[PDB]
Amino acid sequence: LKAFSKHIYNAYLKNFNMTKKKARSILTKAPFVIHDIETLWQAEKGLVWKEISVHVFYRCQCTTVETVRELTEFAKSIPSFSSLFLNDQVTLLKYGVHEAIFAMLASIVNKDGLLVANGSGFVTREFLRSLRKPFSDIIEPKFEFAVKFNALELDDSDLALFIAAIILCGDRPGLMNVPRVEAIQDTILRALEFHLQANHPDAQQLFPKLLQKMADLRQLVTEHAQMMQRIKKTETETSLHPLLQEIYKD
Numbered sequence: 379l380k381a382f383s384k385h386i387y388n389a390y391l392k393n394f395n396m397t398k399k400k401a402r403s404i405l406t407k408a409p410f411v412i413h414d415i416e417t418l419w420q421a422e423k424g425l426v427w428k429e430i431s432v433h434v435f436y437r438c439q440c441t442t443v444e445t446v447r448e449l450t451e452f453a454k455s456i457p458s459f460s461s462l463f464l465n466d467q468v469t470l471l472k473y474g475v476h477e478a479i480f481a482m483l484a485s486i487v488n489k490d491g492l493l494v495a496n497g498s499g500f501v502t503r504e505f506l507r508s509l510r511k512p513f514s515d516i517i518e519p520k521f522e523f524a525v526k527f528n529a530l531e532l533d534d535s536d537l538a539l540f541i542a543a544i545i546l547c548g549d550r551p552g553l554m555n556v557p558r559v560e561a562i563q564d565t566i567l568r569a570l571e572f573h574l575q576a577n578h579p580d581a582q583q584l585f586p587k588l589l590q591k592m593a594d595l596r597q598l599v600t601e602h603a604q605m606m607q608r609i610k611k612t613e614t615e616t617s618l619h620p621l622l623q624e625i626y627k628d
């Protein structure tokens with residue numbers, strides 16, 4: 379179990395360019411501020427990396443698509459996931475990847491904003507709120523989630539397991555081999571509660587709380603998808619990345 383857990387943690391360490399450890403050190407116990415149009419413009423030149431609100435939404439798309447790649451390599455870097463037929467692999471990622479993305483966002487978030495461009499920039503939460511109304515509504519619920527999520531004081535090794543459990547979910551639509559996936563998830567989850575017993579000896583009810591969070595993540599993606607549908611219907615000028623279009627179809 380703990381050996382299985384260290385192997386998941388190492389796949390995490392190998393596949394994600396930004397970790398919570400590194401994120402908190404940048405946010406400082408242990409970057410260029412974009413907060414308006416001028417600072418955005420200065421970032422788009424300075425730190426390298428239509429209308430303003432749409433341009434920020436495009437940058438959000440760049441970021442989610444990139445994190446999909448990393449999550450794919452993370453999942454593949456676990457053997458049980460790789461034993462599954464490639465069609466099951468795709469189904470699991472189709473429906474789990476935005477749950478994982480939003481869980482991981484928390485790592486790079488504090489109450490006031492979030493890191494972008496590999497820690498080089500900080501975009502303030504107030505600026506994001508100031509955007510046109512479709513595009514300002516989508517990111518704010520993630521902050522509300524993140525703050526409550528960050529209170530639990532999880533570390534990267536905790537996250538490696540949590541995110542494995544989100545992707546290996548036997549509940550997804552059109553899964554071919556449900557019992558096999560359920561079997562992997564159970565093992566991840568037993569590895570998680572045992573890991574938390576070691577890693578967080580004092581924290582009471584932590585395991586059940588992370589299960590509720592998984593359920594809450596399901597609901598966050600449900601609302602996120604609803605908002606994405608509205609942008610597709612009402613915002614006829616904004617492009618939508620084809621891979622993300624493949625995810626939202628149903």
Ligand SMILES: CCCCCC/C=C\CCCCCCCCCC(=O)O
Nearest residue numbers: 434437438439441442494501517622
């Ligand atoms: C100008 C700097 C803006 C940086 C924005 C990127 C930062 C974090 C990514 C989280 C964005 C929230 C999700 C927005 C939806 C993107 C499309 C999708 O995959 O659903």
Ligand SMILES: CCCCCCCO[C@@H]1O[C@H](CO)[C@@H](O)[C@H](O)[C@H]1O
Nearest residue numbers: 462463464465466467468469470552
């Ligand atoms: C190991 C690869 C073997 C090839 C089998 C792939 C065919 O399955 C397809 O898988 C897709 C999800 O991945 C579904 O969306 C499609 O409905 C389904 O037709």
Ligand SMILES: CCCCCCCO[C@@H]1O[C@H](CO)[C@@H](O)[C@H](O)[C@H]1O
Nearest residue numbers: 446447450468471472621624625627
């Ligand atoms: C890199 C992993 C992320 C990929 C997730 C995108 C999934 O899109 C789905 O791809 C299936 C395979 O062809 C199609 O059958 C489905 O209709 C489509 O919805």
